[PDB]
Amino acid sequence: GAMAQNITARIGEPLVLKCKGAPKKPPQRLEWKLNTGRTEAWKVLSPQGGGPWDSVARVLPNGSLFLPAVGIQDEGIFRCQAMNRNGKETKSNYRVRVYQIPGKPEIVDSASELTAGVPNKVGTCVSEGSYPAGTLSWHLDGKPLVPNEKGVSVKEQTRRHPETGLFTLQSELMVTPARGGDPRPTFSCSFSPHRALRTAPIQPRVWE
Amino acid sequence: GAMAQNITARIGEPLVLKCKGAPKKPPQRLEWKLNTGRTEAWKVLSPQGGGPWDSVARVLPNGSLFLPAVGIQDEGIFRCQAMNRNGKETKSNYRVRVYQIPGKPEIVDSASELTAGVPNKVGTCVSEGSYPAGTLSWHLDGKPLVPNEKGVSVKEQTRRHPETGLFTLQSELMVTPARGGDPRPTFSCSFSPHRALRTAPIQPRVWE
Ligand SMILES: Cc1cccc2c(-c3cn[nH]c3)c(C(=O)O)[nH]c12
Ligand SMILES: Cc1cccc2c(-c3cn[nH]c3)c(C(=O)O)[nH]c12
Ligand SMILES: Cc1cccc2c(-c3cn[nH]c3)c(C(=O)O)[nH]c12
Ligand SMILES: Cc1cccc2c(-c3cn[nH]c3)c(C(=O)O)[nH]c12
Ligand SMILES: Cc1cccc2c(-c3cn[nH]c3)c(C(=O)O)[nH]c12
Ligand SMILES: Cc1cccc2c(-c3cn[nH]c3)c(C(=O)O)[nH]c12
Numbered sequence: 001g002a003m004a005q006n007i008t009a010r011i012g013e014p015l016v017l018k019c020k021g022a023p024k025k026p027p028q029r030l031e032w033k034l035n036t037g038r039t040e041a042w043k044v045l046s047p048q049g050g051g052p053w054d055s056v057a058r059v060l061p062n063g064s065l066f067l068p069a070v071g072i073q074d075e076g077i078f079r080c081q082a083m084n085r086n087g088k089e090t091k092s093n094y095r096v097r098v099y100q101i102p103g104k105p106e107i108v109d110s111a112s113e114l115t116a117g118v119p120n121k122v123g124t125c126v127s128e129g130s131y132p133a134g135t136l137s138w139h140l141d142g143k144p145l146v147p148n149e150k151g152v153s154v155k156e157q158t159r160r161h162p163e164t165g166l167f168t169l170q171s172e173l174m175v176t177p178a179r180g181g182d183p184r185p186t187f188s189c190s191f192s193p194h195r196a197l198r199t200a201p202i203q204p205r206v207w208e
Numbered sequence: 209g210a211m212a213q214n215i216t217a218r219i220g221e222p223l224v225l226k227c228k229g230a231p232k233k234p235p236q237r238l239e240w241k242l243n244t245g246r247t248e249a250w251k252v253l254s255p256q257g258g259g260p261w262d263s264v265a266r267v268l269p270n271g272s273l274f275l276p277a278v279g280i281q282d283e284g285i286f287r288c289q290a291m292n293r294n295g296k297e298t299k300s301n302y303r304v305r306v307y308q309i310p311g312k313p314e315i316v317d318s319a320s321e322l323t324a325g326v327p328n329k330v331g332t333c334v335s336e337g338s339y340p341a342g343t344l345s346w347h348l349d350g351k352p353l354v355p356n357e358k359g360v361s362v363k364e365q366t367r368r369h370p371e372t373g374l375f376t377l378q379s380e381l382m383v384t385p386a387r388g389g390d391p392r393p394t395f396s397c398s399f400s401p402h403r404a405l406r407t408a409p410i411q412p413r414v415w416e
């Protein structure tokens with residue numbers, strides 16, 4: 001596409017996009033153009049408004065475009081074109097990506113006792129309500145645990161809420177602990193999209 | 209009053225105030241209370257909306273209060289109170305003051321020729337369209353010119369636009385230049401509400 005400002009908008013929160021260069025109050029010669037999941041190619045929005053788009057996006061007295069509640073379908077490109085009283089044309093170009101922060105991740109069904117030298121199911125971590133999906137990762141004493149490595153196996157699962165489209169992630173961690181290691185290791189789970197959300201650590205005990 | 213967050217809102221621009229602690233989507237147990245120039249003491253706004261207030265301020269799906277175009281009469285106090293799913297009450301308290309930036313100040317009717325030793329009309333400076341009024345100040349070589357001093361006299365005039373309520377300021381500067389000084393001094397005028405807006409300097413000639 002063209003040079004744009006990248007906007008990240010939270011699902012459910014309002015979004016205001018400025019039409020740069022426009023008159024501060026009506027009358028204004030401006031046009032908004034948007035191409036999102038709600039549109040078949042470009043849709044033109046006028047200051048006069050009207051029609052179904054009035055429940056979704058309206059042009060404000062100052063010429064900004066306002067979306068009361070951003071949803072998944074508003075991902076896309078939003079463009080404004082305006083004229084001054086002087087006569088200069090100004091263009092504004094936005095790449096809108098939407099997001100939702102899931103709830104705090106949770107470790108469920110954790111093991112109390114690992115046996116060094118064999119593979120062990122450590123636990124299952126669950127994140128609910130993210131958009132885009134994101135990923136779950138595991139940590140040992142603060143160091144990141146890399147899958148397909150030192151007897152570390154991770155399996156993951158993504159599910160979509162049938163109506164909101166928000167993702168629920170489930171991650172299963174299996175380790176083979178090393179004979180002669182920390183007999184009380186600390187495992188955590190973190191969600192990464194924005195900062196990271198970490199779980200409460202689990203501290204199982206190992207046969208050495 | 210009580211402890212509040214101070215909000216400065218530009219006349220003509222939208223304003224969104226977050227109702228902290230509220231659920232991100234309906235159903236929500238929340239109330240907005242506002243006391244501004246549009247109200248006789250407190251006015252309560254509900255998520256259901258309705259009535260004349262729908263042309264002025266509405267409660268968004270996330271419980272924020274939205275004002276499409278702030279005006280002078282929206283100065284005052286905006287309060288929210290909410291219950292989350294856990295059950296805690298959260299309060300949000302805002303003191304909203306509105307403002308407008310005037311256009312660039314201009315020197316009109318400047319003198320090209322001053323005579324040192326007598327009082328001289330240097331010029332007249334004009335600012336249009338501020339809220340609150342603000343004040344005009346004069347500068348000599350970049351250093352601020354203080355009234356009631358070395359033959360420095362300033363007279364000022366404030367006018368109100370009969371429909372928008374915005375202020376137009378007019379300032380007249382009179383100096384008594386000093387014999388033996390800069391024979392080509394530089395005078396500017398600045399508006400102070402936020403940064404300061406300065407005029408193009410005027411450079412008269414002084415007969416020492
Ligand atoms: C009456 C009226 C005024 C303004 C826009 C629309 C649209 C529409 C155009 N693209 N997306 C929606 C429709 C429809 O979709 O039928 N009707 C409208
Ligand atoms: C109750 C309520 C609260 C907040 C916004 C709206 C809008 C609306 C404003 N801009 N875009 C949509 C409409 C509508 O007129 O459909 N109703 C609303
Ligand atoms: C590259 C670019 C950046 C920002 C705005 C535009 C517009 C445009 C938006 N409304 N009206 C026109 C157009 C075009 O449609 O030509 N191109 C643009
Ligand atoms: C201040 C004031 C003057 C006149 C009417 C109303 C209404 C109203 C509600 N439903 N129909 C009208 C409300 C409100 O309940 O928000 N406030 C008002
Ligand atoms: C009652 C009423 C009549 C006509 C327009 C609006 C708007 C509005 C239009 N563009 N932007 C905002 C709002 C609001 O969303 O507050 N209410 C309105
Ligand atoms: C001090 C203070 C800060 C923030 C909100 C409130 C509210 C209140 C707002 N809507 N509903 C109640 C009240 C009250 O009116 O009890 N006091 C408050």
Ligand SMILES: [Cl-]
Pocket residue numbers: 366367368369
């Ligand atoms: Cl007046």
